[PDB]
Design a protein around this ligand. Structure first.
Ligand SMILES: CCCCCCCCCCCCCCCCCC(=O)OC[C@H](COP(=O)(O)OCCN)OC(=O)CCCCCCCCCCCCCCCCC
Ligand SMILES: CCCCCCCCCCCCCCCCCC(=O)OC[C@H](COP(=O)(O)OCCN)OC(=O)CCCCCCCCCCCCCCCCC
Ligand SMILES: CCCCCCCCCCCCCCCCCC(=O)OC[C@H](COP(=O)(O)OCCN)OC(=O)CCCCCCCCCCCCCCCCC
Ligand SMILES: CCCCCCCCCCC1=C(C)C(=O)C(OC)=C(OC)C1=O
Ligand code: SF4
Ligand code: SF4
Ligand code: SF4
Ligand code: SF4
Ligand code: SF4
Ligand code: FES
Lengths: 227, 588, 180, 198
């Protein structure tokens, strides 16, 4: 397949969607609800690009890159002004209810939401109203729960239920009171519940064992090892 | 179109002249944010291109800079020739008020370039430093020895595989280097340093360092003397090398600013200014007008501080020991204002990417008004007490004189260049930081650069800086002290303290660092001692891929043997006192 | 040399002597440290302290932003947590023999805990004593920022401040609530 | 509590010998001649302390010898570059007893911000230091405070009066650290002036 992103021609796999095709080419499109192992659902509306019908097209149309196939002869723009404004607006909408928590959040410096807030260029707050809050759950000795930081990207439920086959995690409630957790307090029963601390793009699910002796990602000494 | 926009500069007449002379396929034009045309030349055509630029109708008369770059780790090299290493040549035409950056690509195995010393004599020290820090050999160089590191140094520090950090201290190596220090007077060979006729049976040799009791720093000059006459002299520098460029590759864009302070340590905010302007070019930031006026005010305060120290130390070097006390009292008045504004005296580190660290504190205008009332009578008293002394004039007038051609061929800038009658100040020729909104004059000399002429030019520059400070006091814009750009590092503190998106931006900017998109930027300013410049290469990361700092004291120290040859040693001391250099500027 | 040059030079020497004598008849410019205390402006970058919030608790939440923003790397700390859940530094040490007093840590602090204070008198006999632990840094009050409290902004629940009790926060709504 | 050089020992101090030692220490601490040695920006602040606005001459510490033989104090005011380290060691060796060392600034203390390939990480790697001044640069009054600290340390050290009679060992006082001395008055600080004023 052949796509044209911002006037540059690229050869991609036609079976891929536009988001993974552009991310494989080194282009930076912000995204929340898409994961390579989970597929596309089009929830967070962060991955907007402007698709044109032909090469001689000025209007275009905002589309979700994760839900759009990277078919042959596609024409899209990432750095289109309207697409950039919409992606910044989506980040701004996610920031309206987000808690003032980065210094005391274990995801700080390792946070996908922080990276996409910086990437869209959104640093000015004009929202002045109240922020919604949530009570937390006890999820056992391994996973710490903090639902204030949730951006409702549905990656936890998709991984845990559809991928991992777990049954005790779900989404409850409604419009902006969507709650992601267990129906009651207790230990997460899946043998693969620990991957939530990397699946979740925010600091909702965190490593409690790390949170005991916490340090930031930049302060770590890492090595490649085998479990 | 903003001033920070990426441009190819294909509309420059020099590009058309090079195309007509050498052909369209002889070079590659690179689009940068440096503001100058960047032209990649083949290595075998470098001397021809340099000669052609030297013989233009309004020729490129000054080699502003010459250095190297390790391109092996550079990932974003789109639109660039294949290169493991590269050597760049920054040339300035004053008649065109233009400049061009030639670039030569080098393979890793074939690291040799023809020398530029037959066209520009300052290429000697520049190529010695490029050989020292990058391992690039220059063919035809008269003496290609190390100039920063000692001669028995292994490796080339500015290469990307050289570890930046300090090695383990060993007393054995210290004792060995002490033994070489004691045996240097016995095993002195007068051919490694580039001299000839090493004892006509009367040419004695003298050493003037490396323990210098003065504020300009400590460095060795080995003198070949016929009685009291200086037949030849080479300076031994690198005794104050701090690896500042290498640290530029090891610090974030924000956390490098205090290191920019300590390049020319009598300059402070003047040293901060070209770095933050070049980073703002990389970030695409246009600062507001109040930021421009604040940075101009602090730059002129530090320029007056540096000029006061320079004039007092020159008067002390002549022999009058009294005015330095009063000049440091005036420096204390300046430091009162600077301490109030920035919280620090000598290295304020107060400029920021996109603005300044804080707003001006309430009551600063009283301190500025008090200093502006204090300064002129003290300056006139210094003039009448020491600068109009005929003994000082006899010590200074006619000593170490050079003309416009000698200043041009050695890269001399600042008061030493302008005392030859060449009107070239960056604040007027290539205006920056809103210097066009100020009414001030540029003092120029009659055509001869003596010690006395340079000192009087610096006195006139001090008076013009006082005029700029008066305009700064009278017309202060009301507005922000930081730009509203998302890459303004750090964001305004109150919004960080109460807004989550601002807190996120601050969190990532102070920890991982601000992300500059991959580009090259350049900013040249008129520093307190000449023209200072930052050339920054970003590879798209939170750290500089390459930080090249051009300082004027390097060029002035290299100019020394061409201006002092055939003079006395007291004249050499007076010349060193009138150059206005610090050794941290030379070595950096 | 010329006779006129000699006379002009003699008059110039007499003028210089006269001005230095009149300088002797002038007012002293000396600030008499230590009997006269040194005035320092309120934002002077001297000795580093850790401060407390107006409720009396230490402001540092051990977020490690000052340590990473330090260009010298002379701040070391470890996060600990009380039973209520508030973050605090288990230890906090600053190598003042390395510190360049640049103020970048105070700039990076999101809680106004770490501050540079107008105090320059920090001379020491042994270099080991220039390593200041938390007992040498934490002071009894708020320092230069008298009212800011990070824990009235944070969404994290601590003692005396539950969910929905921070600034610009609504009370949490259960998903089991009857309202549509 | 003293430290011996020729060991953690006690006070060796007739009552006339103590008075003679006190007189010698008084004369030594009230006449301290620094060596005029410029390394970096910290030297600019040191000679600022030598000027009229600060007047370090009031302590009798202004003579500022250009020869190491006539100097009693070496102030390492600047970075210890690897090319300058043998020079610093040779100039220190040319000094005569008694001699004292003040590290001025973060560079001389530990290498400071220059943990770099060409910088020795602190002058106390190779020469012994009596007083350390943190700062980059320390202000002139910080240098004067270190001078007073050195005077206090000199005022109760024990050195031989003559090289032909008595103990030839040098006893240096194990001072209480300034940090622990000032901890009581420093922690009690509650409010400071807000940084929005002058
Ligand atoms: C009677 C002896 C024969 C006649 C002498 C005439 C005066 C001396 C003379 O010819 O002076 C001109 C001569 C020119 O100087 P020149 O040698 O070219 O350069 C080196 C110094 N500029 O300049 C010199 O030679 C330099 C001056 C030498 C003076 C020697 C003594 C001559 C008599 C005059 C005494 C003046 C004393 C001082 C006056 C001013 C006092 C405030
Ligand atoms: C071996 C030594 C031989 C030489 C000395 C012999 C003995 C003395 C003989 C008489 C000397 C007269 C000197 C000339 C006086 C008049 C001209 C004059 O003052 O010239 C010096 C200088 C000229 O000014 P200028 O440098 O051009 O600056 C621009 C200002 N329009 O103007 C100035 O600097 C400003 C005015 C200065 C006036 C100075 C005092 C002149 C009279 C001195 C009398 C004697 C003093 C004795 C000591 C007094 C102090 C203790
Ligand atoms: C008792 C001790 C002595 C007291 C003074 C005795 C008389 C001294 C007479 C000689 C000196 C007279 C003054 C010389 C002088 O400096 O004249 C300056 C005239 C103007 O010259 P100008 O270049 O304008 O200098 C300005 C200086 N404020
Ligand atoms: C013990 C007797 C001393 C007599 C006077 C000594 C010489 C003058 C004072 C010392 C000094 C010298 C040498 C000196 O050169 C100088 O300039 C750098 C000073 O100012 C800081 C001085 O204070
Ligand atoms: S989840 Fe991310 S953005 Fe939210 S508080 Fe934690 S670090 Fe900050
Ligand atoms: S808890 Fe995390 S993974 Fe789940 S929807 Fe919220 S932000 Fe996404
Ligand atoms: S003032 Fe600068 S050098 Fe000192 S601890 Fe803070 S960030 Fe580090
Ligand atoms: S930046 Fe402030 S709150 Fe964070 S660890 Fe440092 S002192 Fe503590
Ligand atoms: S401690 Fe700072 S001021 Fe002193 S020499 Fe080092 S860089 Fe310069
Ligand atoms: S990543 Fe495409 S809408 Fe979420």
């Amino acid at each position: 397949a052949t796509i044209h992103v911002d006037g540059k021609e690229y050869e991609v796999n036609g079976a891929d969607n536009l988001l993974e095709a552009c991310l494989s080419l080194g282009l930076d499109i912000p995204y929340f609800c898409w994961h390579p192992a989970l597929g596309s659902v089009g929830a967070c509306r962060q991955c907007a690009v402007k698709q044109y019908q032909n090469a001689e097209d000025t209007r275009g149309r905002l589309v979700m890159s994760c839900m759009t196939p990277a078919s042959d002869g596609t024409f899209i723009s990432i750095d289109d002004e309207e697409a950039k404004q919409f992606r910044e607006s989506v980040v701004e909408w996610l920031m309206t209810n987000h808690p003032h928590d980065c210094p005391v959040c274990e995801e700080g410096g390792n946070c996908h939401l922080q990276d996409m807030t910086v990437m869209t260029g959104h640093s000015f707050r004009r929202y002045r109203f109240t922020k919604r809050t949530h009570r937390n759950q006890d999820l056992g000795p391994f996973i710490s729960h903090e639902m204030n930081r949730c951006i409702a990207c549905y990656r936890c439920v998709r991984y845990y239920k559809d991928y991992a086959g777990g049954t005790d995690l779900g989404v409850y409630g409604a419009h902006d009171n969507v709650y992601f957790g267990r129906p009651e307090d207790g230990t997460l029963e899946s043998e693969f519940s620990g991957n939530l601390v990397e699946i979740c793009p925010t600091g909702v699910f965190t490593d409690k064992t790390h949170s005991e002796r916490y340090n930031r990602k930049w302060d770590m000494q890492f090595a490649p090892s085998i479990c | 179109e903003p001033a920070w926009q990426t441009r190819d500069h294909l509309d420059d007449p020099v590009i058309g002249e090079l195309r007509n002379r050498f052909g369209p396929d002889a070079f590659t034009v690179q689009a940068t944010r440096t503001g100058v045309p960047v032209v990649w030349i083949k290595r075998e055509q470098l001397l021809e291109v340099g000669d052609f630029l030297k013989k233009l109708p309004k020729p490129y008369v000054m080699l502003f800079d010459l250095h190297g770059m390790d391109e092996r780790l550079r990932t974003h090299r789109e639109g660039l020739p294949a290169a493991d290493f590269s050597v760049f040549y920054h040339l300035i035409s004053i008649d065109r008020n233009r400049d061009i950056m030639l670039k030569v690509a080098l393979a890793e195995n074939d690291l040799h370039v023809p020398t530029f010393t037959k066209l520009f004599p300052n290429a000697n020290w520049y190529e010695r430093e490029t050989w020292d820090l990058f391992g690039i050999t220059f063919d035809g160089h008269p003496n290609l020895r190390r100039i920063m590191m000692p001669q028995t140094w292994k490796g080339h520090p500015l290469r990307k595989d050289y570890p930046a950090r300090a090695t383990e201290f060993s007393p054995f190596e210290l004792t060995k280097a002490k033994q070489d220090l004691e045996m240097e007077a016995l095993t002195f060979k007068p051919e490694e340093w580039g001299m000839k006729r090493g004892t006509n049976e009367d040419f004695m040799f003298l050493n003037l360092g490396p323990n210098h009791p003065s504020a300009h720093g400590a460095f060795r000059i080995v003198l070949q003397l016929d009685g009291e006459e200086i037949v030849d002299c080479v300076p031994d520098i690198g005794y104050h090398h701090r690896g500042a460029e290498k640290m530029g590759e090891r610090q974030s864009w924000h956390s490098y600013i205090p290191y920019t302070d300590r390049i020319e340590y009598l300059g402070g905010c003047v040293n901060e200014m070209p770095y933050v302007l070049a980073v703002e070019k990389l970030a695409g930031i246009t600062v507001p007008d109040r930021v421009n006026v604040i940075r101009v005010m602090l730059s002129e305060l530090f320029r007056i501080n540096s000029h006061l120290l320079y004039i007092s130390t020159f008067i002390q070097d002549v022999g009058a020991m009294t005015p330095v006390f009063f000049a440091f009292t005036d420096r204390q008045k300046i430091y009162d204002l600077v301490e109030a504004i920035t919280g620090f005296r000598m290295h304020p580190a107060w400029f920021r990417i996109g603005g300044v660290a804080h707003d001006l504190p309430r009551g600063w205008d009283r301190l500025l008004r008090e200093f502006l009332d204090w300064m002129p009578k003290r300056l006139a008293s210094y003039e009448k007490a020491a600068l109009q002394n005929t003994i000082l004039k006899g010590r200074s007038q006619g000593v170490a004189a050079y003309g416009a051609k000698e200043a041009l061929e050695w890269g001399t800038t600042g008061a030493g260049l302008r005392a030859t009658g060449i009107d070239f100040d960056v604040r007027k020729a290539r205006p920056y930081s809103g210097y066009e909104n100020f009414d001030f004059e540029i003092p120029v000399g009659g055509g001869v650069s003596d010690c006395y002429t340079r000192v009087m030019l610096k006195v006139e520059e001090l008076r013009q800086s006082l005029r700029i400070l008066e305009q700064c006091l009278n017309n202060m814009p009301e507005g922000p002290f930081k730009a509203d750009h998302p890459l303004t590092t750090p964001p305004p503190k109150e919004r960080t303290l109460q807004h989550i998106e601002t807190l996120i931006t601050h969190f990532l900017q102070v920890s991982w660092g601000p992300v500059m998109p991959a580009n090259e930027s350049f900013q040249m300013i008129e520093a307190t001692k000449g023209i200072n410049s930052y050339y920054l290469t970003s590879d798209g990361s939170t750290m500089s891929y390459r930080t090249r700092i051009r300082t004027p004291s390097y060029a002035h120290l290299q100019q020394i043997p061409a201006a002092i040859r055939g003079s006395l040693v007291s004249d050499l001391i007076v010349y060193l006192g009138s150059i206005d250099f610090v050794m941290s500027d030379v070595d950096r | 040399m010329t006779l006129k040059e000699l006379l002009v030079g003699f008059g110039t020497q007499v003028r210089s002597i006269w001005m230095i004598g009149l300088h002797a008849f002038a007012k002293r410019e000396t600030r008499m440290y230590p009997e006269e205390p040194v005035y320092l402006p309120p934002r002077y970058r001297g000795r580093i302290v850790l401060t407390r919030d107006p409720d009396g608790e230490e402001r540092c939440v051990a977020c490690n932003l000052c340590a990473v923003a330090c260009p010298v790397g002379c701040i070391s700390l470890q996060k600990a947590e009380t039973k209520d859940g508030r973050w605090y530094p288990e230890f906090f040490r600053i190598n003042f023999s390395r510190c360049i007093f640049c103020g970048l840590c105070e700039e990076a602090c999101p809680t106004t805990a770490i501050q540079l204070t107008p105090d320059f008198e920090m001379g020491e006999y042994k270099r080991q004593d220039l390593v200041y632990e938390k007992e040498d840094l934490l002071i009894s009050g708020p320092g230069k920022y008298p009212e800011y409290n990070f824990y009235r902004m944070a969404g994290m629940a601590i003692d005396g401040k539950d969910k929905g009790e921070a600034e610009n926060e609504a009370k949490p709504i259960d998903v089991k609530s009857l309202l549509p | 509590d003293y430290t011996l050089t020729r060991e953690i020992v006690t006070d060796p101090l007739n009552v006339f010998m103590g008075k003679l030692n006190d007189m010698v220490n008084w004369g030594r601490k009230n006449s301290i001649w620094p060596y005029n040695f410029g390394l970096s920006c910290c030297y600019v602040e040191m000679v600022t302390s030598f000027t009229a606005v600060h007047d370090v001459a009031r302590f009798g510490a202004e003579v500022l010898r250009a020869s190491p033989r006539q100097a009693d104090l070496m102030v390492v005011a600047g970075t210890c570059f690897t090319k300058m380290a043998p020079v610093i060691q040779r100039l220190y060796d040319q000094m005569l007893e008694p001699k004292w060392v003040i590290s001025m600034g973060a560079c001389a203390n530990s290498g400071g911000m220059y943990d770099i390939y060409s910088v020795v990480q602190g002058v106390d790697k190779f020469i012994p230091v009596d007083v350390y001044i943190p700062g980059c640069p320390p202000r002139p009054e910080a240098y004067m405070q270190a001078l007073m600290l050195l005077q206090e340390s000199i005022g109760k050290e024990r050195r031989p009066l003559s090289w032909v009679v008595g103990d030839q060992g040098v006893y240096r006082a194990n001072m209480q650290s300034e940090r622990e001395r000032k901890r009581g008055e420093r922690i009690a600080v509650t409010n400071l002036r807000t940084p929005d004023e002058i």
